[PDB]
Design a binder for these strands. Structure first.
Length: 217
RNA sequence: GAAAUUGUUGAAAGGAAGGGCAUUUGAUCAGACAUGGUGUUUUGUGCCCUCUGCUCCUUGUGGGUAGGGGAUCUCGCAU
């Protein structure tokens, strides 16, 4: 499968895998299928990133991995009041697979490789909320993304997902949102529900209360 | 080829010797092929300046290795 080359031990094969994936992913009609394939592809990309542990090259890989989201269904269509039919639903599957892979393989990350994955998730989050429609502003797209993201990372009611990822999201949300350059659907602040949801991780509640709600924005 | 034991040379000490605390005297043993470091001034070199090349991975804030031209040169070395 395609994941075999992405997880190969040879740099040439790994880079060729991403080069071919750049088109295999823009082959949307082929990729408009079950989410399991997207999950497997993101698992392979996880190993591909794991195989690089050099500061500058890992940033080079991370930026392209984040830009892969924009490459998926580039907003050249300019969907004037059109729903997620065959365009945004497929990208939602890729986003869900990314988060599933990241959550499942969180503890497997070693101490030194943790920064690589933090940078990768930061880049992916930057590409997200940048590509829903041509830009952030979209009612239905935001609602679907929120419902397909609120239930996985920031749920805070299921201990299956480690609270470290919510902590990083809290720490980077405002830092990355301002990178988009004044009004936005930022309904996204989820955090109030987490605070109101009693029995949730007290550490996460304290972190969101301190770092997030204390900002003037 | 060690003790118990025995004979010689030398030192010491003399109805006993043996051990502990502190020290003098006598004899005797160790006691750096350490010979540096710093900033300045001549001169010759290279991994130094410039031109022209080859070679390994992967790809990388690299490594290895050549042929022409000088003392802008203390970047290092030797004076």
């Amino acid at each position: 499968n395609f994941v075999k080359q992405l997880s190969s031990n040879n740099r040439k094969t790994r880079v060729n895998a991403l080069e071919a994936l750049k088109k295999y992913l823009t082959a949307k009609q082929f990729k408009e299928n079950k989410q399991i394939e997207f999950n497997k592809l993101w698992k392979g990309l996880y190993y591909a990133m794991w195989f690089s542990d050099r500061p500058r090259p890992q940033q080079r890989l991370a930026n392209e991995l984040g830009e892969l989201h924009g490459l998926y269904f580039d907003p050249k269509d300019n969907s004037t009041a059109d729903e997620l039919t065959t365009n945004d639903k497929a990208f939602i599957k890729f986003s869900r697979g990314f988060w599933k892979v990241m959550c499942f393989e969180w503890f497997n990350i070693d101490r030194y490789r943790l920064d690589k994955y933090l940078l990768l998730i930061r880049r992916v989050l930057f590409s997200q909320l940048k590509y829903l429609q041509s830009r952030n502003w979209d009612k239905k797209l935001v609602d679907e993304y929120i419902k397909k993201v609120l239930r996985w990372l920031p749920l805070s009611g299921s201990p299956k997902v480690y609270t470290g990822i919510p902590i990083h999201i809290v720490d980077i949300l405002l830092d990355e949102w301002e990178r988009l350059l004044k009004k936005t659907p930022l309904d996204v602040i989820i955090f109030q529900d987490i605070v109101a949801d009693y029995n949730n991780s007290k550490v996460l509640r304290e972190k969101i209360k301190e770092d997030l709600f204390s900002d003037t924005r």
